[PDB]
């Protein structure tokens, strides 16, 4: 995943088999070192 903090993102094609892509908005995720982004909304995630 490409997580952008307090901004936006654009998908991009990669002509692979059954290439699903979806951009997401409203994520507040965790890693081991605590939270990744800080803006509650305005976060972004890409699932390919």
């Amino acid at each position, epitope marked *: 995943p490409a997580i952008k903090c*307090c*901004g*936006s993102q*654009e*998908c*991009t*094609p990669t*002509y692979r088999p*059954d*290439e*699903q*892509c*979806k*951009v*997401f*908005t*409203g994520v507040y995720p965790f890693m081991w070192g605590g939270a990744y982004c800080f803006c509650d*909304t*305005e*976060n*972004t995630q890409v699932s390919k």
Partner: antibody
Amino acid sequence: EVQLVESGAGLVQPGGSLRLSCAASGFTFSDSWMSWVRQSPGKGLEWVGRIKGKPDGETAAYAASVKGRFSISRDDSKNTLYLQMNSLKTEDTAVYYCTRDDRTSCRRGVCYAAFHSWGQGVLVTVSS
Amino acid sequence: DIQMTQSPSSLSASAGDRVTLTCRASQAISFYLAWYQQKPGKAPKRLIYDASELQGGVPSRFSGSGSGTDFTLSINSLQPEDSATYFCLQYDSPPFTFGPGTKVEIK
């Protein structure tokens, strides 16, 4: 904040030629789907056109009422989106908006992009 | 051309309440609906895209839910900065048709 500024509008001798331009700044320009929309009195918003990026060939899909008359021709040497309108009718006049189209899901190659951003808008006056 | 209907067209209310809006479609558009907003003499604003993903910059009292031909736009709290015309967008198959609009007003 993506920046967009409409320019080149005003009064016209109808049935003829005209140009509008959108001097953009705030995103990767040569990898950007961009589009136009127009708003009419008494009638809502009509999509006019969408131009594609250099990784697709700078192709341009249009609408029904404008095939062969409206043509989009961008250029990467200057971040600016052109629209060279031709053979003006009496309903073509409308408040135009240049827009950016962020792609949000690519399902089996062909992608799908809404209208993210907008310009301030400009008035085109087709009368006599 | 997918002729939409942006129904209702007059759904005024008062503060603190809840209100909804519909943009129903002929063909089955999967989730590629975008609820927008417009104000007097200003440009529009993307509110919700993909029917379930709120745009970055929009207060959370708006919310999306729907698929196919039937969709919603739930305002959990109509504070008075929402005097506006709300639209709906379709970007699965050209032409990129909109609904006519709904003129949400207040007094």
